[PDB]
Amino acid sequence: KKRYVAMVIWLYSAFRGVQLTYEHTMLQKK
């Protein structure tokens, strides 16, 4: 039952890098 360990952190530190550098000013009318 190791479903929540390899597919939980692999993205926790992969998507965050995108939802912050290209979200600060993109679809928020700056």
Side-chain angles (χ1 to χ4, degrees):
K1 195 149 187 92
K2 281 267 177 201
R3 300 233 307 174
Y4 282 120
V5 56
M7 236 188 272
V8 59
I9 306 302
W10 262 242
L11 309 139
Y12 180 62
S13 301
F15 199 50
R16 285 283 131 164
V18 188
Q19 209 184 298
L20 176 86
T21 323
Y22 224 55
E23 280 284 85
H24 61 119
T25 63
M26 252 296 286
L27 219 76
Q28 259 273 128
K29 300 216 170 237
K30 232 114 71 80

